[PDB]
C-alpha cells in the first residue's frame, strides 16, 4: 500500500535515495534543497504526514535518523 500524493511521494523516495547514494537519511534542510521547499517548515509537514499515514519513522533526538515502514 503506496496511497500517497506527489510531493509526499517524492519526499519518501528522498529518504531511499540519500541512504543509496551516500549511506545516511535526510534532514528537512536536505528535503528543501533538491525538492525546493522555501524554509525547513514545508519541508516538515510532509515528513510528519508520511508517519501519520503509517510509512516512515522518525527518531526524536538525532535529526539524520528516519527508518522506512513500507516498501523496505
Do not use: W
Not at 545516511?24 to 524554509?39: C, D, K, V
Not at 508520511?50 to 535529526?63: D, T
Amino acid at each position: 500500500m503506496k496511497a500517497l500524493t506527489a510531493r509526499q511521494q517524492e519526499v519518501f523516495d528522498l529518504i531511499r535515495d540519500h541512504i543509496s547514494q551516500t549511506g545516511m537519511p535526510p534532514t528537512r534542510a536536505e528535503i528543501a534543497q533538491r525538492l525546493g521547499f522555501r524554509s525547513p517548515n514545508a519541508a516538515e509537514e510532509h515528513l510528519k504526514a508520511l508517519a501519520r499515514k503509517g510509512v516512515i519513522e522518525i527518531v526524536s533526538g538525532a535529526s539524520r535518523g528516519i527508518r522506512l515502514l513500507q516498501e523496505e
